């Protein structure tokens, strides 16, 4: 992974470049930068960089040269190696070739084409294509970042740019930093939307294999471990990665509360035999509960399995009828409902929206 | 074997990039037929980038050199004296690579500069690579590795203008020699015919340092490595070597190459002098002092095995340029001594390869790889060519079952330091008083040369010292020379118009020692590969027949024969325009060509005679095969090494004894 | 000195580490007096680590070379043709540094190898460093930069055994030349006396490529750079160059160094041929083609100013080894053309410095620094010497108030590409057919040589081609040469025992051009620095007095005199043992020394051979004192030969001998076909 040296200049017959000025310059950079990384010019000879076909060329020497070349006439044209290696092109040897309809015309210029000048309509196209909750998240991210800019001329400059994309984004962002947004400038406003760019709107996940389920249990109650084991078996036969957490490690317990965290799971389940945990020298205060509250507040499916759920829900301040909140006595009926929540992945109704 | 796996064949196929994409490389991609070149022309940039980066730094010393692969064969099971695996059975064969080199020149400097020469041999043993990084000369200039950059600075070109290339004939070098008297012994060797050897095959190899042989039971003896050439010993004369430096900068690498190609690969007996630990100070000097030899009188040589060089590299850069020798490449059964020169060397060779290779993985280059499996926890670094499966690379571990295991004296045939070795005393930056005699052994060496050899050595000093600008440095040089031999200093001083100081005989003696003289070593034991130039003419059909008859008779005895005429044609190998007496070990003039020796547009005025005359001046066997011609040359027909016969078979019988004698020293005036 | 700020003085003081701690460096730290060395000895390891890392990679080409500082002085205000600031006022002065080199040999190889030569000039202008990275020869081998590694591989040593060093005399080079006929022009210059110049000071400089001059109003003209040597042009002879290569591999660097030290710093008129854009195809060939010259008959030179080298470096490695030239170091007022060899060079020079310097900050080396402030947002990288105050190194910014400001045609004196330049057509890897004539101009060049020069050229070809093993390659070479001149192919063919092919006259003509002949550029305009060897003897008190009188008179005219004798003493500079005819431009024997013309003090015949080599190589030679016939007869040198002198009078001898030194070479002494 560390030594792999990618290059857009590694191209094959049948593909070609375009005159995109960003692409064009990248072609120079990747060839040059591997000199820095490898410290010598023979970086294509590293295993991960080698091709899987024979190499026939007149490149020679350099620090780290791994090859011992037989051909002692590495120049073209030659007769002393019978004209080999032969030149490859469009008509012979399956040569790379530039697309023959490409042309250039005009002055040699260091100028920006005017066709590149609209910087605002597509960011607006993008913003219009996100759901209301996704819109809030994007606004919240900007409020987070721009609130940490010390320069009060930089924040004003940022609002000016955002304003040309969307007045509403500008106003909502400015509210977090106590500055007024500038007046609407609708040259680039529009209402078009486009498919495929929204995450929250691309449906439930088409699969839940590998998703991670944290089962919060206890060693005080041997029935809590039984409830967890039962829950383990039925989750694992659907390919979820299941972690049973308790106070200490023992058979059937994967992690301790001390190392467990809500970022470690895509769904959190409490077995109702463990309800008491919801102080100790073995984990920080409030840890088992905090795992539950965090997963809840981050929009993850959460639940209590076994039938007594109100002690847990009440302590967590999680409503029993909330979307993404599961309480069932039967393990089987629990898993079926919970697995739908895992596919939904995030329960977006737990986050507030600007009016 | 790592070598064969990495050979790349380009005798067929289409041009590709380094990632296997077929391409062209003859024209740049341009915006129109007369337009500017495009940045997106990746074919251009990958080829030129490779070209821009082809060069690596030259070795700090021994930058000019040439190598060959071969085989070492042991003559016996040597477990009586050493645990070394490559020496543990009669006939046991181990592949080698050897590089020979000068010391001071940069990578494109002349083979035939006067210099000390490197002789570095790698044994790819079945217990690891073992390197003997040795010399043509048994003693070194200095007694402490910390002085190496001082010596090298002073012998390398002056740092303001970088003059002179590959030469001690300037003020700084002789300033250093005259202030650092440890230099005397090696200086005398480099000023004798040893500094200008006739080829790499005609020099011996020495480890210089005293090392240890260590048995599996832990006892050790002290050793010197001596590689004794089977080709005999031979040198050029100075005036010839200078001309050669300009006519053929590649003379030794060519010689080594051609010898191997023609089935004449050179050979050396790998020997040691062996002495007990208790003899460290018994010979009248300290065996830790690298400026001294053990005279063969006090310790004879034992023959351990045969070193043969018999295959040329496939790519000079990948093999000869990249080979990275280290005295730290040692195997069980060999150990170091407290020789302060050797001690410091161990640090430098590991460190200098980061400069050359630009990365820490230089032992992965095919020429540096061992022939046995590598088990260790070294990881990562630039240019990492391995993919390690062990994901617990630390000791002690249980996660990889305690592997790799520690190897030591008891377990895994591990290298181990000779267990008898001790240290005692203050931590000091002090030179041992036992190292203080700088002059007796150079005198011993001088005493052991023949009169003519002694004259060449005086003449070499006269030549160099006469080039030193500073009158003070010249006096200081006479002061030191005088302490080796009053006579040397007197004779040297005559050439530079100074008076020698008065005799100071504290170090004078009359002792000689065997095996250090080139002239005194008798005629060459083989004449295969020696070069004969036949000077002939296209004007006379007789001349070309005399030449062709001589050819076939010389060629059978393995001589390399070159027929020279005005212009090339069947039977003629070289023109007069490109021929020089330095191209040959003997010159024969076929009498059919007598007219050429009295002008032509095909060659410079006087060239044919000058070839013959230079050859004679330089001590070479010369002949005429049919005379009158010996007079145009001023060559006395009765002189030794001058052959005149009408007969073809008797010319050759006689002339070949000439080649064997090699040099005719009566042609040189003595003081 | 322009780099005084970076100088380190070690004429006094105690040895220290690189961090200022006083230390010793002569003995290693040992456990006991005969003990092993200690790892804790940092004095040893810092000192050896430095030494272990002293070497850097040599240049990929032009590895062997030498340099000096100087001054360029403008002869006028050149704003009428160029916006370039270093040319904007009469008498404006700009520090330069120049490096001269051969092309193919490694470091250490001999200065007098037969080769093309590099002539690279840096102008440290008040508007940035500007480099002209040029040559001693006006044309290059190949027409597209992409072919450079092919040319360089074929001419460099063969890669199995690395033989031969610094020489085109081997199969691969001639295979390339014969298969790639664009090579013929440069090949004929290399094979002539231009391949073996007498010194760096006796050669001209050329940009090779057409460049553009651009005025502040944006109009442009096409230029060729010509640096005309004020010392005159002079070559060696091949047989001499070969001996020199072995007797003094440092010949050109020493000649340069001594010339500057004696106050004889070499000079050039820096000139241009200027032509209009619309003449790109007017002269019978394409100005974008680097294998062609604009004959002087068609576009005369304009002298722009004086280049003088007058100061040697202090540290060769720091200055000459590390200087890193780039045609990308360009300044406002100059621009590139679409020459495909030039276009690709732009890329290589920037890239190859990463190799040599081992890191991206090579422009911070003292020798590469500009002489004006640097304001940009380049940061970090290995070996970063600067400490940048601006913590907002991006554009556009407000947090650093929009600085540094963008420079262009209308603000900040920015570089700008010539506004009239355009491209049109398909994106192609095709050669323009306007580049297709490879033979007419090598023929033009050959015609403009004197008959003796033509003989030398033929003889250089015979010498090299006779060393090619492959009979196919040799045949292929006669095929190309034959397209240039049937006569050259016949005469070379004769040396190698092969018939020349039938005349093929598509490209034959009788046209000649001025200023490419060395032997026809009259006598040298100055003899200062020329080397006179006086052979003499210690046996005779009177030979040393003739030598002294002769020294005094010659040194008066700035000639470098060496008295040679058996042994050194007052007034004798060199022994016969070290002297050779290659060390001198002229050889005089004082007639007190007639007897020398065998000893333990020099090889047999050495004194005579010095005189005979000097005569045979075309040098002025003579005998001074009045009795000449004994020296001259021993040498087979006729008393009435041109460039042979005999006079009793010192005054008269010298006046005649100095005319010979100006003629420099007496060409009547070499046979013709
Ligand atoms: C501590 C500095 C030092 C000292 C005291 C020596 N050397 Fe060394 N030697 C080096 C530092 C070095 C070096 C800088 O590390 C080189 C340069 C490139 C390399 O591999 O190591 C080297 C190269 C080198 C080579 C070239 C290897 C090859 O062909 O690649 C030979 C033959 C020697 N040395 C031999 C000797 C001998 C016989 C020495 C004294 C007995 C000696 N060296 C002392
Ligand atoms: C595409 C590669 C390429 C091509 C087509 C050329 N060169 Fe070049 N040249 C290099 C790539 C290069 C290089 C590999 O980049 C060097 C080696 C070290 C360096 O600084 O640049 C170089 C070095 C170099 C030097 C040495 C500068 C110095 O002393 O440090 C000179 C004078 C020239 N070149 C001149 C020329 C001329 C007159 C050319 C044809 C008109 C030419 N080069 C074509
Ligand atoms: Ca590096
Ligand atoms: Ca010096
Ligand atoms: Ca070749």
DSSP string over B428-477: E----GGG---SHHHHHHHHTS-HHHHHHHHHHHHHHHTT---HHHHHHH
Residue whose structure tokens are 């008040």: C126
Instruction: Tell me if chain A has a CB within 8 Å of the CB of C123.
Output: no
Query: Do B413 and B449 belong to one domain?
Result: no
Domain boundary among B510, B526, B542: B526
User: What is the full DSSP assignment across B490-529?
Assistant: HHHHHHTT-PPPPP-GGG------SS--SGGG-S-S--TT
Its CATH class, for the domain covering A208-355, is alpha beta
Question: Backbone dihedral region of B624: left (phi > 0), alpha (psi from -120 to 50 degrees) or beta?
Answer: beta
Number of CB pairs, chain A paired with chain B, less than 8 A apart: 215
Query: Do B251 and B307 belong to one domain?
Result: yes
Q: In angstroms, rounded to a whole number, what is the distance separating the alpha carbons of residues A89 and C6?
A: 53
For B22, the token pair is 């077929």
Instruction: Tell me if chain B has a CB within 8 Å of the CB of A28.
Output: yes
How far, in Å, are A183, B606, C670 from residue C631 at the CA level? Answer: 107, 18, 22
Residue whose structure tokens are 């000439």: B658
Q: In angstroms, rounded to a whole number, what is the distance separating the alpha carbons of residues B436 and B443?
A: 15
The CATH number of residue B670's host domain is 3.40.50.880
Domain that holds residue C232: 1-427
Domain count, chain B: 3
Query: Do B432 and B515 belong to one domain?
Result: yes
Q: Which of B15, B21, B36 sits opposite A85 (nearest CB)?
A: B15
Q: In angstroms, rounded to a whole number, what is the distance separating the alpha carbons of residues B493 and B496?
A: 5
| C9: helix, strand or coil | coil
CB contact under 8 Å between B51 and C148, yes or no, is: yes
The residues, any chain, with a CB within 8 Å of residue A317's CB and separated by 6 or more, are A293
Task: Kindly report the number of other CB atoms within 10 A of residue C350's CB atom.
Answer: 17
* DSSP run (H or E) holding B310: strand B301-311
For C14, the token pair is 């105690």
Give the neighbours of chain B: at least 3 Cβ pairs within 8 Å: A, C
Q: Which residues of C touch A41 (CB under 8 A)?
A: 355
The number of the ligand nearest the C-alpha atom of C164 reads: 5
User: Using an 8 Å Cβ cutoff, are B294 and B312 in contact?
Assistant: no
Q: Which of B36, B162, B578 sits opposite C343 (nearest CB)?
A: B36
Q: What are phi and psi of C541, to 5 degrees?
A: -65, -30
The residues, any chain, with a CB within 8 Å of residue A252's CB and separated by 6 or more, are A225, A228, A229, A232, A244
Q: Which of B247, B432, B569 sits opposite C246 (nearest CB)?
A: B247
Task: Give the residue from C455, C511, C504 showing the smallest Cα distance to C478.
Answer: C504
Q: Which residues of C touch B63 (CB under 8 A)?
A: 55, 108
How far, in Å, are B656, B662, C442 from residue B525 at the CA level? Answer: 12, 11, 54
Q: Which residues of C touch A58 (CB under 8 A)?
A: 149-150, 153
Strand partners, B623: B588, B643
The residues, any chain, with a CB within 8 Å of residue C116's CB and separated by 6 or more, are C102, C103, C135, C136, C137, C186, C189, C190, C195
Q: In angstroms, what separates the C-alpha of C655 from chain B's closest C-alpha?
A: 29
Q: Answer yes or no: is the C-beta of B138 below 6 A from any ligand 1 atom.
A: no
Q: Which of B42, B261, B360 is the best residue to mutate to test the A interface, defined by the most A CB atoms within 10 Å of its own CB? A: B42
Q: In angstroms, rounded to a whole number, what is the distance separating the alpha carbons of residues B628 and C627?
A: 32
Task: Give the residue from C63, C227, C61 showing the smallest Cα distance to C132.
Answer: C227
For B149, the token pair is 């950059």
What is the distance in A from the centroid of ligand 2 to the CA of C348?
8
Helix B648-661 to helix B541-555 angle, to the nearest 10 degrees? 50
Task: Give the residue from B369, B418, B375 showing the smallest Cα distance to B122.
Answer: B369
Q: What share of chain B is helix, strand, coil (3-state, %, to 5)?
A: 35, 20, 50
Q: In angstroms, rounded to a whole number, what is the distance separating the alpha carbons of residues B404 and B392?
A: 10
Domain boundary among C427, C451, C469: C427
Q: In angstroms, rounded to a whole number, what is the distance separating the alpha carbons of residues B141 and B147?
A: 10
Q: Which residues of B touch A63 (CB under 8 A)?
A: 53, 56, 356-359, 383
Query: Do B416 and B500 belong to one domain?
Result: no
Instruction: Tell me if chain B has a CB within 8 Å of the CB of C401.
Output: no
Task: Give the residue from C530, C547, C532, C649 showing the smallest Cα distance to C596.
Answer: C547
Per-residue DSSP letter, C434: G
User: Using an 8 Å Cβ cutoff, are B278 and B221 in contact?
Assistant: no
What is the distance in A from the centroid of ligand 3 to the CA of A68?
22
| B610: helix, strand or coil | helix
Residue whose structure tokens are 């031979």: B234
Q: In angstroms, rounded to a whole number, what is the distance separating the alpha carbons of residues B223 and B363?
A: 28
The number of the ligand nearest the C-alpha atom of A37 reads: 3
The number of the ligand nearest the C-alpha atom of B467 reads: 4
Query: Do C107 and C5 belong to one domain?
Result: yes
Q: Between residues 88 and 117 of chain A, which touch chain B (CB distance below 8 Å)?
A: 88-89, 92-96, 98, 104, 108
How far, in Å, are A38, A157, C373, C387 from residue C378 at the CA level? Answer: 21, 26, 14, 12
Measured CA angle at C282 (ends C276, C284), to 5 deg: 145
What is the distance in A from the centroid of ligand 3 to the CA of C531?
46
Task: Let me know if A153 is exposed, middle or buried by CB neighbors in 10 A (0-12, 13-18, 19+).
Answer: exposed
The residues, any chain, with a CB within 8 Å of residue B229's CB and separated by 6 or more, are B201, B202, B203, B204, B266, B267, B268
C543: Cα within 13 Å, side-chain hemisphere: 23
The number of the ligand nearest the C-alpha atom of B162 reads: 4
CB contact under 8 Å between A28 and B45, yes or no, is: yes
Residues contacting ligand 2 via CB (< 6 Å): B 48, 52; C 59-62, 65, 99, 101, 118, 120, 133-135, 140, 145, 148, 208-209, 290, 323-325, 341, 344-345, 348-349, 352
Q: What are phi and psi of B343, to 5 degrees?
A: -55, -40
Task: Kindly report the number of other CB atoms within 10 A of residue C334's CB atom.
Answer: 20
CB contact under 8 Å between A32 and C351, yes or no, is: yes
User: Using CA positions, which residue lies closest to atom 31 of ligand 1?
Assistant: B118
Query: Do C182 and C325 belong to one domain?
Result: yes
Residue of A nearest to B363 (CA): A64
Task: Give the residue from B671, B609, B600 showing the smallest Cα distance to B634.
Answer: B609
Q: Answer yes or no: is the C-beta of B148 below 6 A from any ligand 1 atom.
A: yes
> In b/e form, how buried is each residue of C356-392, taking b as 16+ CB within 10 angstroms?
bbbebbbbbbebbbeeeeeeeeeeeeeeeeeeeeeee
Expressed in angstroms, the distance from the first to the final Cα of chain A is: 47
Alpha-carbon dihedral sign for residues C594, C600, C604, C610: negative
User: Using an 8 Å Cβ cutoff, are A164 and A188 in contact?
Assistant: yes
Q: In angstroms, rounded to a whole number, what is the distance separating the alpha carbons of residues B498 and B377?
A: 64
Strand ordering across the sheet containing C531-535: C574-575, C560-565, C531-535, C586-590, C621-624, C644-647
What is the distance in A from the centroid of ligand 4 to the CA of B495?
20
C236 preceded by cis ω (within 30°)?
no
Q: Between residues 34 and 63 of chain A, which touch chain B (CB distance below 8 Å)?
A: 35, 37-47, 49-63
The residues, any chain, with a CB within 8 Å of residue C261's CB and separated by 6 or more, are C312
CB contact under 8 Å between C423 and A104, yes or no, is: yes
Query: Do B481 and B549 belong to one domain?
Result: no
Per-residue DSSP letter, C371: S
Task: Give the residue from C537, C605, C532, C535 showing the smallest Cα distance to C566.
Answer: C537
For B420, the token pair is 């008898």
Q: Between residues 190 and 219 of chain C, which touch chain A (CB distance below 8 Å)?
A: none
The residues, any chain, with a CB within 8 Å of residue A91's CB and separated by 6 or more, are none
B634: Cα within 13 Å, side-chain hemisphere: 9
| C37: helix, strand or coil | strand
Q: What are phi and psi of A137, to 5 degrees?
A: -55, -50
Q: In angstroms, rounded to a whole number, what is the distance separating the alpha carbons of residues B451 and B530?
A: 26
Number of H helices, E strands in chain C: 16, 18
Task: Give the residue from C380, C354, B350, C149 showing the smallest Cα distance to A38.
Answer: C354
Q: In angstroms, rounded to a whole number, what is the distance separating the alpha carbons of residues B498 and A94?
A: 78
The number of the ligand nearest the C-alpha atom of B167 reads: 4
Considering the segment(s) A109-207 as one domain, its CATH architecture is Up-down Bundle (1.20)
Strands (E), chain A: 68-69, 103-107, 212-216, 241-246, 255-256, 267-271, 302-305, 325-328
Q: What are phi and psi of C623, to 5 degrees?
A: -130, 130
Per-residue DSSP letter, A48: G
> In b/e form, how buried is each residue of C173-195, taking b as 16+ CB within 10 angstroms?
bbbbbbbbbbbbbbbbbbbbbbb
Residue of A nearest to B7 (CA): A68
User: Using an 8 Å Cβ cutoff, are B480 and B179 in contact?
Assistant: no
Q: In angstroms, what separates the C-alpha of A108 from chain C's closest C-alpha?
A: 5
Task: Let me know if C635 is exposed, middle or buried by CB neighbors in 10 A (0-12, 13-18, 19+).
Answer: buried
What is the distance in A from the centroid of ligand 3 to the CA of C51?
17
Could you identify the atom of ligand 1 that is nearest to the CA of residue B142? Answer: 5
Query: Do B133 and B16 belong to one domain?
Result: yes
Q: In angstroms, rounded to a whole number, what is the distance separating the alpha carbons of residues A49 and A63?
A: 17
Q: Which residues of chain C come before a gap where C and the next N are over 2.5 Å apart? A: 597
Pairing of strands B205-206, B211-214: unpaired
Q: In angstroms, rounded to a whole number, what is the distance separating the alpha carbons of residues B181 and A127?
A: 85
* DSSP run (H or E) holding B246: helix B238-247
CB contact under 8 Å between B44 and C145, yes or no, is: yes
Query: Do B347 and B396 belong to one domain?
Result: yes
Q: Answer yes or no: is the C-beta of B323 below 6 A from any ligand 1 atom.
A: yes
Pocket test for ligand 2, best of C56, C57, C58, C59 (most atoms within 8 A of CB): C59
What is the distance in A from the centroid of ligand 1 to the CA of B266?
23
Query: Do C440 and C584 belong to one domain?
Result: no
Strand ordering across the sheet containing A103-107: A103-107, C422-428, B30-31
Instruction: Tell me if chain A has a CB within 8 Å of the CB of B666.
Output: no
The CATH number of residue B486's host domain is 1.20.1370.20
For C94, the token pair is 């700009």
Q: In angstroms, rounded to a whole number, what is the distance separating the alpha carbons of residues B156 and C317?
A: 13
Alpha-carbon Rg for chain A in angstroms: 30
Could you identify the atom of ligand 1 that is nearest to the CA of residue B145? Answer: 5
Q: In angstroms, rounded to a whole number, what is the distance separating the alpha carbons of residues C510 and B132?
A: 65
For A143, the token pair is 């409020």
Q: Which of C44, C347, C356 sits opposite B146 (nearest CB)?
A: C44
C373: Cα within 13 Å, side-chain hemisphere: 4
Q: Between residues 372 and 431 of chain B, which touch chain A (CB distance below 8 Å)?
A: 380, 382-385, 387
Task: Kindly report the number of other CB atoms within 10 A of residue C477's CB atom.
Answer: 26
Helix B471-484 to helix B171-179 angle, to the nearest 10 degrees? 40
Q: Which residues of A touch B356 (CB under 8 A)?
A: 63
User: Using an 8 Å Cβ cutoff, are C291 and C185 in contact?
Assistant: yes
| A257: helix, strand or coil | coil
The CATH number of residue B272's host domain is 2.40.180.10
Query: Do C313 and C380 belong to one domain?
Result: yes
Domain boundary among C526, C544, C578: C526
Query: Do B465 and B585 belong to one domain?
Result: no
The residues, any chain, with a CB within 8 Å of residue C354's CB and separated by 6 or more, are A35, B52, B53, C360, C362
User: What resolution (Å)?
Assistant: 2.2
């Amino acid at each position: 992974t560390e030594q792999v040296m990618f290059q857009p200049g590694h191209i094959v017959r049948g593909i070609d470049f375009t005159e995109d000025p960003l692409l064009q310059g990248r072609l120079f950079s990747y060839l040059d930068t591997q000199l820095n990384r490898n410290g010598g010019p023979n970086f294509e000879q590293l295993p991960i960089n080698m091709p899987r076909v024979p190499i026939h060329n007149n490149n020679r020497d350099g620090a780290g040269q791994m090859f011992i070349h037989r051909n002692k006439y590495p120049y073209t044209p030659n007769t002393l190696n019978s004209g080999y290696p032969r030149q490859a092109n469009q008509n012979a040897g399956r040569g790379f070739f530039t697309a023959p309809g490409r042309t250039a015309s005009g002055a040699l210029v260091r100028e920006v084409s005017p066709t590149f000048n609209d910087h605002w309509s597509q960011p607006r196209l993008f913003f219009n294509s996100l759901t209301p909750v996704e819109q809030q998240f994007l606004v919240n991210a900007m409020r987070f970042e721009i609130s940490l800019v010390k320069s009060e001329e930089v924040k004003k400059n940022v609002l000016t740019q955002l304003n040309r994309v969307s007045h509403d984004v500008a106003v909502r962002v400015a509210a977090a930093i106590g500055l007024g947004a500038p007046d609407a400038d609708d040259t680039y406003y529009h209402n078009n939307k486009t498919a495929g760019v929204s995450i929250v709107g691309s449906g439930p996940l088409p699969t839940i294999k590998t998703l991670r389920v944290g089962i919060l249990a206890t060693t005080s109650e041997s029935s809590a471990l039984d409830q967890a084991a039962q829950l383990r078996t039925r989750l694992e036969k659907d390919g979820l990665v299941v972690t049973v957490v308790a106070e200490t490690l023992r058979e059937g317990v994967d992690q301790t509360y001390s190392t467990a965290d809500a970022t470690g799971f895509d769904g959190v389940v409490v077995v109702d035999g463990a309800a008491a945990l919801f102080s100790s020298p073995l984990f920080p205060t409030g840890r088992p509960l905090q795992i539950f509250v965090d997963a809840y507040r981050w929009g993850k499916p959460v639940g209590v399995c076994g039938g007594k759920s109100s002690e847990v829900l009440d302590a967590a301040d999680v409503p029993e009828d909330g979307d993404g909140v599961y309480s069932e006595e039967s393990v089987d009926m629990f898993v079926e409902e919970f697995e739908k929540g895992l596919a939904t992945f995030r329960f977006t109704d737990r986050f507030a929206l600007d009016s | 074997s790592p070598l064969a796996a990495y050979e790349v064949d380009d005798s067929t196929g289409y041009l590709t990039s380094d990632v296997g994409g077929p391409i062209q490389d003859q024209t740049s991609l341009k915006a129109g037929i007369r337009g500017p070149t495009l940045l997106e022309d990746f074919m251009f940039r990958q080829k030129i980038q490779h070209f821009d980066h082809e060069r690596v730094p030259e070795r700090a010393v021994h930058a000019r050199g040439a190598g060959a692969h071969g085989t070492f064969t042991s003559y016996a099971d040597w477990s009586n004296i050493t645990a070394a695996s490559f020496l543990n059975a009669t006939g046991k064969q181990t592949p080698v690579f050897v590089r020979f080199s000068t010391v001071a020149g940069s990578r494109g400097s002349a083979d035939t500069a006067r210099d000390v020469h490197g002789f570095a041999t790698r044994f790819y043993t079945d217990e690891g690579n073992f390197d003997i990084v040795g010399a043509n000369i048994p003693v070194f200039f200095i007694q402490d590795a910390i002085q190496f950059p001082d010596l090298i600075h002073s012998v390398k070109p002056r740092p303001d203008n970088e003059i002179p290339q590959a030469a001690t004939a300037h003020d700084s070098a002789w300033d250093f020699f005259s202030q650092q008297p440890s230099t005397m012994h090696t200086l005398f060797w480099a000023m004798s015919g040893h500094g200008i050897p006739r080829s790499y095959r005609h020099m011996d190899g020495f480890g210089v340092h005293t090392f240890r042989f260590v048995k599996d039971d832990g006892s050790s003896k002290l050793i010197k490595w001596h590689f004794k050439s089977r080709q005999g010993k031979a040198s050029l004369v100075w005036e010839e070597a200078q001309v050669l430096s300009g006519k053929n900068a590649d003379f030794h690498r060519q010689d080594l190459w051609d010898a191997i190609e023609s089935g004449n690969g050179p050979e050396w007996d790998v020997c040691v002098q062996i002495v007990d630990e208790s003899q460290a100070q018994a010979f009248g000097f300290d065996l830790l002092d690298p400026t001294k030899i053990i005279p063969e009188e006090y310790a004879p040589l034992t023959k351990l095995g045969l070193l043969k060089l018999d295959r040329n590299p496939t790519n000079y850069f990948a093999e000869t340029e990249q080979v990275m020798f280290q005295p730290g490449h040692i195997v069980r059964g060999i150990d170091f001594t407290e020789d302060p020169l050797l001690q410091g060397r161990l640090f430098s060779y590991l460190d200098t390869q980061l400069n050359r290779n630009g990365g820490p993985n230089f032992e992965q280059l095919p020429i540096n790889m061992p022939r046995v499996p590598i088990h260790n926890n070294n990881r990562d670094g630039a240019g990492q060519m391995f993919i390690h499966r062990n994901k617990y690379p630390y000791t002690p571990n249980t996660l990889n079952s305690g592997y790799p295991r520690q190897a030591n004296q008891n377990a895994g045939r591990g290298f181990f330091t000779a267990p008898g070795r001790t240290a005692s005393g203050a931590l000091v930056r002090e030179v041992s008083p036992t190292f203080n005699d700088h002059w007796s052994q150079p005198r011993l060496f001088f005493n052991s040369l023949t009169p003519v050899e002694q004259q060449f050595l005086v003449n070499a000093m006269r030549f160099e010292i006469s080039l030193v600008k500073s009158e003070e440095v010249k006096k200081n040089v006479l002061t030191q020379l005088n302490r080796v031999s009053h006579d040397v200093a007197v004779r040297v001083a005559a050439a530079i118009g100074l008076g020698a100081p008065d005799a100071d005989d504290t170090y004078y003696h009359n002792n000689k020692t065997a095996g250090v003289s080139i002239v005194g070593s008798g005629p060459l034991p083989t004449i295969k590969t020696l070069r004969v130039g036949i000077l002939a003419t296209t004007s006379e059909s007789s001349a070309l027949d005399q030449a062709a008859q001589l050819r076939t008779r010389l060629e059978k005895d393995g001589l390399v024969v070159t027929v020279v005429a005005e212009t090339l044609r069947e039977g003629v190998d070289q023109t007069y325009s490109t021929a020089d007496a330095t191209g040959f070990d003997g010159v024969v003039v076929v009498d059919g060509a007598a007219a050429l020796f009295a002008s032509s547009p095909l060659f410079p005025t006087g060239r044919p005679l000058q070839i013959f005359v230079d050859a004679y001046r330089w001590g070479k066997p010369v002949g005429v095969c049919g005379s009158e011609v010996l007079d145009a040359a001023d060559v006395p027909e009765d002189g030794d090494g001058v052959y005149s016969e009408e007969s073809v078979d008797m010319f050759v019988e006689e002339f070949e004894k000439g080649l064997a004698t090699f040099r005719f020293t009566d042609r040189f005036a003595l003081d």
